[PDB]
Swiss-Prot record:
Keyword check for tRNA processing: no
Effect ascribed to mutating residue 197 to Q: Loss of activity
Molecular function terms, GO-annotated: 4 iron, 4 sulfur cluster binding; metal ion binding; quinolinate synthetase A activity
Reactions this protein catalyses: iminosuccinate + dihydroxyacetone phosphate = quinolinate + phosphate + 2 H2O + H(+)
Comment text on domains: Contains three domains displaying pseudo-three-fold symmetry that each contribute a cysteine residue for ligation to a centrally located [4Fe-4S] cluster.
Lineage: Archaea, Methanobacteriati, Methanobacteriota, Thermococci, Thermococcales
Highest taxon in the source lineage: Archaea
Name of this protein: Quinolinate synthase
Amino acid sequence: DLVEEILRLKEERNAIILAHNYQLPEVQDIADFIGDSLELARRATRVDADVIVFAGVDFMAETAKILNPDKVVLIPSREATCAMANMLKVEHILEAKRKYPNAPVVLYVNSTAEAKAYADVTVTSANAVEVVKKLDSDVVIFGPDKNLAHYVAKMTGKKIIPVPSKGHCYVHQKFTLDDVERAKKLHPNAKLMIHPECIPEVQEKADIIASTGGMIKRACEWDEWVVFTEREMVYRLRKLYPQKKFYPAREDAFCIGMKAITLKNIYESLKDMKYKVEVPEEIARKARKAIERMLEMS
Ligand code: SF4
């Protein structure tokens, strides 16, 4: 029985399990903390665990390691990867800095640790506007998501240059205006909670624009919601709010990287102490400074 063995090994390893909101229900049920990556990493800094098992994708485990350098961070599969974060290369950043002289470089926290090391500051979707409004530049380099960049440009009035120019999340790009229309026909009493990684024309139809943490916070505002994000979030919301209704905007909105994590490989991760996530000291130092600036600016 995986669950029993996982729980026993978690105690033996002095480990905590951090699960992203898109993890399967059976994985979330054995997690200590559930949320988005930055809040998970920060919550781990307040406990004296020796090991973090990160049920999530590579860049999220990296953020955990950046904020918890004295803990062993394990990712159950190195195939738990983020296509959007992987679109951005260091060369994209250096080239953009050359093309937009002196413009600040802002990195969405959904990004690799290496990319954060070239950032002046990081942002979450929830603090991106507040942070960017404090940059005294009409032009801002922003990556890796062009769709969040559009939202930031709209809310700040600044010229936001996405890096890379076509960076985006393939999961959230699946949502279309037809999915909006289908939702309104089938669920006329529902409101639409839409992730800022969705395309601009879909964002425009939202009742709320929110990351997963904001979806949980603002779900209290209505009794029925159609959810424009990765489909496992619906189960997360249903378990949090059993008396509300939540429906996926698309049944096929599936992050392959997130589903690389299984009960079986969480068991194997704890049993064998793999796969170790490391962040080079200099990259970690610079990524840490960009995260610290984000707190100072919000
Ligand atoms: S849902 Fe998109 S942005 Fe999130 S981990 Fe998957 S590919 Fe990356």
